[PDB]
Design a protein around this ligand. Sequence first.
Ligand code: HEM
Ligand code: HEM
Length: 104
Amino acid sequence: SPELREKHRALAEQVYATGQEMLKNTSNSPELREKHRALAEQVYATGQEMLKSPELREKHRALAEQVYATGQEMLKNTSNSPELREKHRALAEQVYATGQEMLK
Ligand code: HEM
Ligand code: HEM
């Protein structure tokens, strides 16, 4: 449980740093994009595995799905409109906020 929670946290930090870096660029390398995606998948999978406030957990999970689905759409595009990029960053900050609120 604690080892799994700290893996999830460390993966989430790497998803945020890779995300923040790509936000500064009108185009990112396939290499950076796929690092971000493959980290996002491992963050999703460690979270699910921890379910192996119920209300805070439910909101966080739901938000994580919405961020992943906006990601699936950006995966189809060589370049992403800054409106899809904003929707994704916005939902993403909400997922980080709810995760951190689970510590307290
Ligand atoms: C997918 C994007 C996600 C991000 C960016 C994210 C991020 C975070 C962060 C930063 C924390 C706080 C970790 C800490 O400081 O200890 C956390 C906690 C947690 N997350 Fe996630 N998460 C994601 C997905 C999910 C999903 C899909 C689930 C389950 C469906 C999940 C389950 C949990 C649980 C249960 C905790 C609390 C751990 C505990 O109390 O021991 N996460 N998350
Ligand atoms: C848990 C959080 C996140 C998840 C699960 C996630 C997931 C994804 C996925 C699956 C993609 C598609 C990969 C691709 O387009 O090649 C993507 C793209 C992207 N994500 Fe994230 N992401 C998260 C957080 C963030 C954050 C915090 C930011 C910015 C601060 C961000 C910025 C981006 C950008 C800019 C792209 C598109 C890159 C491009 O068009 O070059 N992501 N994300």
